[PDB]
Amino acid sequence: MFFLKDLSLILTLHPSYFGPQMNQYLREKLLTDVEGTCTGQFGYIVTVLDGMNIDVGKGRIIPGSGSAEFEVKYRAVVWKPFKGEVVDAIVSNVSPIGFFADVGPLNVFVSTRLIPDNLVYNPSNSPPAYMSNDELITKGSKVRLKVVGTRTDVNEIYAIGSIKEDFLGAI
Amino acid sequence: GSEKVLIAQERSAANIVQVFKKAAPSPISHVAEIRSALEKGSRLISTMQ
Amino acid sequence: LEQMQDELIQQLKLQMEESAIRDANNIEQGKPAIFKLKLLPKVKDILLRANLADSILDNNLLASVRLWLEPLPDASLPAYQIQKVLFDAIKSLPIKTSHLRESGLGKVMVFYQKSKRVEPNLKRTAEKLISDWTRPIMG
Amino acid sequence: TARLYQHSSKSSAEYPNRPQLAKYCIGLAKYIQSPLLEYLALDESMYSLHIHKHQNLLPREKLIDAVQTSIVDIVNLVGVDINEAVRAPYHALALPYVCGLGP
Amino acid sequence: STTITSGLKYSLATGNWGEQKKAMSSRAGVSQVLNRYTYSSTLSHLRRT
Amino acid sequence: PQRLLIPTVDDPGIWGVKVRLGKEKDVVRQILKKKLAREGTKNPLEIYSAFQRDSFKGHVYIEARKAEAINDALKGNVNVFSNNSKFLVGIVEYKDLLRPVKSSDVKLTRGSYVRVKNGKFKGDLAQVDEVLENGLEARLKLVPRLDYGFRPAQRLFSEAEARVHEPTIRRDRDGFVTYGGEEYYEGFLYKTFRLQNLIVNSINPTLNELSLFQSNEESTTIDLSTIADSLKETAKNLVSFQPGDNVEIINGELNHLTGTVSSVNQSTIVSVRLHSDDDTINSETVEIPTSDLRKIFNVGDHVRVIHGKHTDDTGLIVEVNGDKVEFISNQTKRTVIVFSNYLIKSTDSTVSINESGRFELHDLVQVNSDLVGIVIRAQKDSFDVLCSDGKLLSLPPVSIYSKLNLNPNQQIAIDSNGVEVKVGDTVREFTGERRQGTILHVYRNFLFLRSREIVENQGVFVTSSNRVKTI
Amino acid sequence: RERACMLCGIVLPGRVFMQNGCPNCDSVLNLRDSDQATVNECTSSSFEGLVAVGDNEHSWVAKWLRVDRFQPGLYAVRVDGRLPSDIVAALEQYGVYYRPRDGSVI
Amino acid sequence: DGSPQHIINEVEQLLQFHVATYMDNDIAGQPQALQKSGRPVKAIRARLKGKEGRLR
Amino acid sequence: EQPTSLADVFEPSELKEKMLTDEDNVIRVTDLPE
Amino acid sequence: SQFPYSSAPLRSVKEVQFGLLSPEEIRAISVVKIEYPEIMDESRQRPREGGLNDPKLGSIDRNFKCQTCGEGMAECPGHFGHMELAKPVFHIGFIPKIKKVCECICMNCGKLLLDETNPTMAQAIRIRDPKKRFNAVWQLCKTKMVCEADAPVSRGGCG
Amino acid sequence: FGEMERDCMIAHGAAGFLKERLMEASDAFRVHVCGICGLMSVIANLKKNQFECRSCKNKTNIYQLHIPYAAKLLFQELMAMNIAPRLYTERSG
Ligand SMILES: [Zn+2]
Ligand SMILES: [Zn+2]
Ligand SMILES: [Zn+2]
Ligand SMILES: [Zn+2]
């Protein structure tokens, strides 16, 4: 789910960049170091609002190292999945152990043990799919799934979905 | 292999009565002290006050 | 002063018996025993008060103590908190042979001693208390 | 097979008081004596051998099936002694790959 | 024979005048290494209290 | 009877006296001899009994009525210390001083499976074919460890190989063979072992040894009573609790109730706050014995395996089949079914791979005869390798050939301009993404650059030496 | 070398038990008239808790150990091993009940 | 195994003494813990005090 | 206080590795190449 | 710049908060349980796991890395283990304070011997400094030698 | 560089020289502290780039400090005596 959050970043600048263009350079450095990153605490930062008019304040010189430390506060759009949430998805891969879907930047893996039994995996089909009499879910097929668990990594998030309840599966 | 020397040790003589004045913060004003030592061996045995 | 303590202890006895009956019914109705746990704090506070021991012995509250300690017909032992509190109270009071005769707690004490689901510390305390209570009879 | 055998714990259990180079030489000698049995001893590590230039392009299941078919064909062309297989498990490695049979 | 030998040797070697296991509370510095920097220093050391 | 003999106030008192260690039985014998010698005399030793216990070291207990009697008994003995270290034993302690010990088990049962403390079969599981009536030794059924001409692996005694390597085999019966002074019965060694050579509790069986032992019984593991008892012991002892664990109650009046562990005291009393639809009940904390608690595992929780073949494996709970719980693994990324007794709800893995396998992180290893790669992430069961091509592979540690140990005279890199670049230097890609990083390993024309800015594969990316320039 | 007679609980050297038998249990065990197997089955060298008794009649310990009707001497609190089934039946024939001193029975 | 109160008191008092002297070996009113060489044990408290202690 | 299934005795992964499951017995009984 | 790079931000200490360690915290921050008195496994290197020289506690050898953090000798700070005591024992540094606290409260109901009804007690509670507050409360409650099961109405005491 | 020299350096007012003498020219050390419990119990693995405080079960609120090795030793010896010195990088009032 997408949100607006007020975040802050600590930026350290080398003395070789102490020029008139210091502020703009700090702005592009912030944009390059925040746009697209993935933090387990917050999720995924997709964009920074008002990216060219961010206040940086006054940097403090670190005693003994010369480099200046800047405290940058900004508002950004953040997306983070939650346990027990039902969202739309697009299937990216089909495999005997289960199928992998994509919910924005997040890639969700659904095991066969969380798939209804009638959706038997068909490897002979082109492309291979988990199909039933009235349902056929393959690569590129819209699916509505509920996120059950989320795994936190260093700079990545792994989520597990399920389609075993009602109003789920193919859409 | 190392040469060791015994340094003479100074001590108070025995078998002599020593009378001392104790300080004010005490019920005792004067003390008579004597330490006894047998002639054979010259070893300290007991002290009396 | 002390007539009032006897009345209060009798009221506590009635409350304890009613709570035991309610918990037994609830277990028979498929529900956990909660009333004994609810009444446990007040019983603990009353028992910890030493000067009320004489009134307790004059009202024979040990009968209700044994009733609580008596295992229910489902072969389920009482809650460990209840057993611990009752054992501590039994230690804290001067139980004599007459009080044991009035209450008949020796049977439950022997059952606790012989049983194995009982905590080993409670087993040792039961052995100690049984020996102490047999002490006056033989001398 | 010798390089893989010098690191396998099967050699360590077989030879607990021998150096790694001794295990390597033993693997070489066993390969000379019988290449088929040594290739069988690889068990799962045989799939990591450099078999074909584009061996990694195939899916793992297809490559495993191809290896199984090749080894079954070869061992059935060879033949397995039941008595020796019972006498020694090393010669019994070839028993599951006979046609009709299985692990 | 080791008792007296070791006791005397230890007390003379280390300077602690007492039993080895009672090193604390024993008078230390009784035995010292002879000063041989010059003849006068040795003579002075041998007559020290 | 036994109950009626408990002591009274008028019974003779008991005194305990400290003595020198190891002389307790000597003092007892001396006291008995003195009592016998002075018996029938004008001044007999007016005591009644004296004894000691092995556990209560340095103490000798005498039953008498007077302290002067104790002094008279101790007079003339050298093991008694200088001070009269005597105390009056409390009457309640009278039963405890003479209560028996080691009553945990009645006896060693013939046919039971036990482990061996020492000897050539140190640790091998052994069946108790015979229990000697003395109780100090017992004849056991073992798997022979022979080489037939640092110990050989256990193996059933093979008569043909034994004769080929040693034709001096003896025969005494049918199926009972004596080779080299050792009696082997139908392929299994039968040898007496002392009681001090066996572990009769906390026995850990393996299905391999169980099959090797039960194959001759015409059925695979037909006997399973002692095995079931061992399973119960392993299940009971392996349970460890922490605050915040969701548990369920098996026995007691509060059976079939859920609660969260609030605090842990010792290892047998756990304070639990129960959860129920009634608010007044949810605000109460109950101390409950651990023997009547079962962990509650909800679907979609990070859980780490405590013990077993999958030790230190973590994952997310997927299916809860009562006793057995299923979870998708993190390293192998496959479903594993392990009992709920071997799982702990650990929200963070942080698995350390040290002391496992042969290779560590950032190791340039040879995948096969053609492919050479570097380690990006290590697992308890396998390794993740980035190869020179730019792809990722997963292989067991055994399958990997070996580490490519290269001297600085072998690991040499030359940039586009021809200037030599060594290990750890920083270079920038001449074209393409124009990235930069520190060199990790050099192989042929391939360089393994790592940069902290890059997140993919922990910043490791392969770039040819011809496309980078020295910084 | 010393062994503890299982029945009465006395402790004496095993060779003494073989040559002379148990001075107390000879009325029901015939230990002297018994072979080494029976001596071992009624006298065990593995025991614990050496006990010296001076006056059987008045010692509460002797009553507690049921040795107040036996000869004073060396006795063991706990003795490893129990009487055999055949010897148990033989003693039950005599009308004497055997209470094990192994501690496992109480 | 078996619980004579005198033995329990002795052993628990020994444990209390060891734990106390592990952190403070200058408790006035009782003998200090000594090493096999006869020197007193350097408790943790002694590590922190004096000119040669941690702080100074 | 008083109370065999090999599933409870050892982990299912170990049982499948050692070939002691119901699929194993069905395969061994079945008259067909594996 | 002499330290290997760590992604954690570098900050400086601004406050030192003291206190005691709860047994729960000691068990939580520990990495291994110490139970075997033998320092060495079999005097054949590789000190016994679960002993006083467990490799998980940290490494002090150049060629041995810590089994907990994986860092070298120059970087491993050392990791704590915990030892369970069979019976609780006094902390030698707090015995006088334990005695004072025992004097301040009742040994049965576990409640203070004085209440805010006393003007002096309320005045003492009004102070802010914990040490002076405890000193005043002890000076007052020392004199009170009997628990009251009734108000000096029940005050919660046991009498 | 004893205490009297430290007092002389304080009197001169040279804080940078004093810090350099007592840290860079001596036992300088780097530790990680949990941002919640405030203890030095973070199990930091620099090569794998993962930090984790088991007691607080957090992976994010973690900072690093530069303190003298003797200070680390003193805090560990204090923890050995059941005293918990918690280091916090922000004030609270
Ligand atoms: Zn006899
Ligand atoms: Zn470490
Ligand atoms: Zn009170
Ligand atoms: Zn923390």
CATH of the domain at G57: 3.30.40.210
Residues 6+ apart with CB under 8 A from B15: B34, B35, B36, B37
Partners of residue F87 in chain H, C-beta under 8 Å: 6
Q: Judge: J89–H19 Cβ closer than 8 Å, yes or no.
A: yes
Strands of F125-256, DSSP E: 125-127, 137-142, 170-171, 176-179, 182-185, 188-194, 198-199, 246-249
- Distance (Å, whole) CA C112 – CA C83: 10
Q: Judge: I34–D99 Cβ closer than 8 Å, yes or no.
A: no
- List phi, psi (to 5°) of F263: -140, 155
Sign of CA dihedral A82, A88, A92, A97: positive
- The bridge status of strand A157-162 relative to strand A106-111 is parallel
Terminus-to-terminus CA distance in chain E, angstroms?
32
Q: Judge: A40–K16 Cβ closer than 8 Å, yes or no.
A: no
Cβ distance F80 to F74 under 8 Å?
yes
Find the Cα–Cα–Cα–Cα dihedral F185, F187, F193, F199, rounded to 10°: -130
Cβ distance K55 to J29 under 8 Å?
yes
Cβ distance F177 to F186 under 8 Å?
no
Residues with Cβ–ion distance below 5 A, ligand 4: K 34, 36-37, 53, 56
Q: At A42, which CATH number?
A: 3.30.1490.120
Q: Judge: J92–H12 Cβ closer than 8 Å, yes or no.
A: no
Listed in sequence order, the DSSP H helices in H1-56 are 5-23, 44-48
- Distance (Å, whole) CA F450 – CA F442: 12
Q: Judge: K55–J29 Cβ closer than 8 Å, yes or no.
A: yes
| A90 shares a domain with A163 | yes
- Distance (Å, whole) CA J109 – CA J158: 6
Residues 354-413 of F with CB under 8 A from C: none
Q: Judge: B3–E36 Cβ closer than 8 Å, yes or no.
A: yes
Q: Which ligand is nearest to the CA of G23?
A: 1
C-alpha pair distances (Å), H35 with each of H43, J57, K57: 12, 25, 42
Q: Judge: F97–H4 Cβ closer than 8 Å, yes or no.
A: yes
Tell which of A82, A104, A134 closes a domain. Answer: A82
- In chain K, where the domains are located: 1-81
> What subunits make at least 3 CB pairs under 8 angstroms with A?
F, K
- Distance (Å, whole) CA F15 – CA F68: 12
Tell which of A29, A58, A82 closes a domain. Answer: A82
The DSSP secondary structure of F285-302, one letter per residue, reads EEEEEGGGEEE---SS-E
Say whether A46 sits in a helix, a strand or coil: strand
F21 burial class (0-12, 13-18, 19+ CB within 10 angstroms)? exposed
> Which of G67, G69, G72, G1 has the alpha carbon at shortest distance from G40?
G1
H35 to chain E nearest CA, in Å?
10
Q: Say how many C-beta atoms besides its own lie within 10 A of residue G82's C-beta.
A: 21
F269-272 long-range contacts, CB within 8 A, separation 24+:
F270/F241, F272/F247
| A51 shares a domain with A95 | no
Point out the residue among K43, K65, K76 whose CB comes nearest to the CB of J68.
K43
Point out the residue among F10, F253, F268 whose CB comes nearest to the CB of C32.
F253
C-alpha pair distances (Å), G11 with each of A43, F55, F101, F135, J42: 80, 19, 19, 18, 39
- Distance (Å, whole) CA F233 – CA A59: 64
- Distance (Å, whole) CA F46 – CA F66: 8
Residues 12-31 of I with CB under 8 A from F: 12-15, 18, 20
**Amino acid identity of D43?**
D
- Distance (Å, whole) CA C12 – CA F179: 81
- Distance (Å, whole) CA C112 – CA J158: 29
Instruction: Count structural domains, chain G.
Output: 1
Q: Which domain holds residue A31?
A: 1-82
Q: At A157, which CATH number?
A: 2.40.50.140
C-alpha pair distances (Å), F28 with each of F284, G14, G21, G53: 58, 20, 23, 10
**Amino acid identity of J20?**
L
- Under 8 Å CB pairs connecting chains E and H tally to 8
| A129 shares a domain with A64 | no
How many angstroms does the Cα of residue K29 sit away from the middle of ligand 2?
14
Q: Which ligand is nearest to the CA of K59?
A: 4
- List phi, psi (to 5°) of A110: -115, 120
The fold of the K1-81 domain, in CATH, is: DCoH-like (3.90.1800)
| A53 shares a domain with A1 | yes
Cβ distance F468 to F420 under 8 Å?
no
Expressed in Å, this structure's resolution amounts to 3.6
F134 to chain K nearest CA, in Å?
51
Q: Say how many C-beta atoms besides its own lie within 10 A of residue J87's C-beta.
A: 9
Cβ distance K61 to K34 under 8 Å?
yes
> Which of F9, F14, F5 has the alpha carbon at shortest distance from F65?
F14
Point out the residue among G41, G50, G81 whose CB comes nearest to the CB of F25.
G50
Q: Which residues pair with K58 in a beta bridge?
A: K53
- Distance (Å, whole) CA K48 – CA F212: 44
Which tokens belong to D43?
């068990």
Which stretches of chain I sit within 8 Å of chain D by CB?
19, 27, 33-34
C-alpha pair distances (Å), A111 with each of A94, A117, F266, F332, K58: 11, 12, 41, 14, 28
Q: Judge: K47–F348 Cβ closer than 8 Å, yes or no.
A: no
Q: Which domain holds residue G47?
A: 2-103
| A16 shares a domain with A68 | yes
The side-by-side arrangement of strands in the sheet containing B18-21 is: B18-21, B30-37, B44-48
Say whether F101 sits in a helix, a strand or coil: coil
G93 burial class (0-12, 13-18, 19+ CB within 10 angstroms)? exposed
Nearest residue in chain J measured CA to CA from C89: J108
Nearest residue in chain E measured CA to CA from B6: E31
Listed in sequence order, the DSSP H helices in F121-206 are 159-165
Cβ distance C60 to C103 under 8 Å?
yes
Q: Judge: D50–F371 Cβ closer than 8 Å, yes or no.
A: yes
Partners of residue B10 in chain E, C-beta under 8 Å: 49
Question: DSSP label at F458?
Answer: G
Q: How was this structure obtained?
A: cryo-EM
Partners of residue H16 in chain J, C-beta under 8 Å: 89-90
> Which of D66, F351, J5, F46 has the alpha carbon at shortest distance from G59?
F46
Which tokens belong to F65?
């009525």
